[PDB]
Amino acid sequence: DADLAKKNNCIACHQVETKVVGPALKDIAAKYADKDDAATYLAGKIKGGSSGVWGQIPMPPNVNVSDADAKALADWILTLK
Numbered sequence: 001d002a003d004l005a006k007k008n009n010c011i012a013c014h015q016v017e018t019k020v021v022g023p024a025l026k027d028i029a030a031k032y033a034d035k036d037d038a039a040t041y042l043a044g045k046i047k048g049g050s051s052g053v054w055g056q057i058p059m060p061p062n063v064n065v066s067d068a069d070a071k072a073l074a075d076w077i078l079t080l081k
Ligand code: HEC
Pocket: 005, 008, 009, 010, 011, 012, 013, 014, 021, 022, 023, 028, 032, 042, 045, 046, 049, 050, 051, 052, 053, 054, 055, 056, 057, 058, 059, 060, 062, 063, 064, 065
C-alpha cells in the first residue's frame, strides 16, 4: 500500500517501518492510535504539529490532505498493521 500519504506529504517524512524526520508510521499508529479510535484523538496532534512529543524536528501543521482526501488517509493509517 502507501500512495496517498506519499502523493501529498505524510510519507515525505513518515515511512512504514523506518523514519526520516519524525517517527515512522508503524509506530505513530502503534504508539497512540493502537488502542481505541485514537485516529480521531491524535487527529488533534497531526494538525497541532509536535514539538517535544517524540524528539525529532517539530512537524508543521499538516492534518492529512484537504477535505475528504485527508480522511481517506487516516483510514490507511489505522490499517498499516
Ligand atoms: C516531514 C516534513 C513531515 C511530513 C511531510 C509529515 N510529518 Fe508528521 N511528523 C514529522 C515529524 C518530524 C514528527 C515528529 C515531531 C516531534 O515531536 O518530534 C512528526 C510527527 C507526527 C505525528 C505525531 C504527533 C504526536 O503524537 O505528537 C503525527 C500524528 C503526524 N506526524 C502525522 C502526519 C501526517 C498525517 C502527515 C501527512 C499529512 C504528516 N505527519 C506529514 C514530520 C513530518
